[PDB]
Design a protein around this ligand. Structure first.
Ligand SMILES: CCCCCCCC/C=C/CCCCCCCC(=O)OC[C@H](O)CO
Ligand SMILES: CCCCCCCC/C=C\CCCCCCCC(=O)OC[C@H](O)CO
Ligand SMILES: [Ca+2]
Ligand SMILES: [Ca+2]
Ligand SMILES: [Ca+2]
Ligand SMILES: [Ca+2]
Lengths: 178, 178
């Protein structure tokens, strides 16, 4: 509760379960990556861009969730507006996806991996598009369920976007490279 | 400003630069992975655990910062309390590191990469330990610096923990595997 009067063991016991749920969920990514071992081995450069893609997804979603949590608190939006938020946000995500995808493809050209120009460009557009929706809809789901985002919203978006982020990336990679 | 009366283009134009700043910073991770291409080549399974390790780092650090941002706002702590938070938090981080390390090491055994058991296990302890300190100190650093931690920290911790997290993991990889 009160940090100034909490000891190491006390803080450890207060924080541990939430991180443990997050890592147990987090391990699924390693299972997904093992299933794509052949493309990873065939083209080593595929591994180079996993953090940037997943990270850009998580940034997009947490920016998205932060706006929605704000609009819900100020009663600017209500829970019935999730149909409207969804339809508008898939426009914003397309725009953000193409924009950021343009930058990252330029980095792949600089690195000189022509086989990965379509793989990365397609993936980030889809990753940003989908991570944007996940961020926008979590505040609605949590509020409908009596949960306050502060502790929960940010790592939930990050972990969701990592799994859906890999699933998109390696699938596009398996398709275009094999 | 107000989400309900902003259109897709307005929403994109208002969000784009911050995401663009984040991805240009994020590209450093790909350069780092390229500098370790040989260790990536030596053991394909190394790539399998990059999202989990970096993801667990970001979770730990953002949990830590949220606690500190709370204590500073409710003024249980002020900016001068930073040495004690540091000394206390390196106890909490060690405990959190050993705990999550035990879980992730168990997953590496399940995946059947005995050769990677010490590399991953050691790396997660270091990643959790340092990311926990980073989270606790940014609210102190940001406030002393005329920045409000609340608005920026969450993607800030995520990007720091990805770079430092990659640097720890791959370095441990050459030391034990090369
Ligand atoms: C003490 C340590 C406990 C942690 C150890 C966890 C064991 C694996 C389960 C992971 C659940 C989440 C990820 C989904 C798991 C997919 C399982 C898998 O990898 O199956 C491949 C296997 O080699 C075919 O027999
Ligand atoms: C595209 C299929 C969408 C359905 C998939 C659901 C899974 C989560 C996704 C969005 C909902 C987020 C949860 C928000 C809870 C909303 C409450 C609701 O349904 O509101 C409409 C209105 O109130 C009734 O009259
Ligand atoms: Ca290879
Ligand atoms: Ca992340
Ligand atoms: Ca190889
Ligand atoms: Ca070679």
């Amino acid at each position: 509760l009160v940090y100034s009067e909490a000891g190491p063991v006390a803080l450890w016991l207060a924080r541990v379960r939430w991180l443990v749920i997050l890592i147990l969920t987090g391990m699924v990514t390693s299972s997904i990556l093992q299933g794509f071992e052949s493309v990873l081995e065939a083209v080593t450069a595929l591994a180079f861009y996993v953090p940037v893609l997943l990270g850009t997804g998580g940034n997009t979603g947490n920016q998205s969730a932060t706006l929605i949590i704000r609009a819900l608190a100020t009663r600017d939006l209500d829970l019935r507006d999730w149909r409207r938020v969804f339809l508008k946000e898939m426009g914003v995500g397309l725009l953000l996806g193409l924009t950021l995808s343009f930058l990252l493809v330029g980095k792949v050209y600089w690195d000189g991996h022509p086989l990965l120009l379509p793989v990365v460009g397609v993936s980030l557009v889809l990753i940003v598009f989908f991570a944007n929706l996940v961020g926008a809809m979590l505040p609605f789901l949590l509020r409908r369920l009596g949960v306050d985002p502060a502790l929960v919203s940010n790592p939930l978006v990050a972990t969701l976007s990592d799994v859906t982020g890999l699933l998109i990336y390696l699938s596009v990679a398996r398709l275009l490279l094999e």
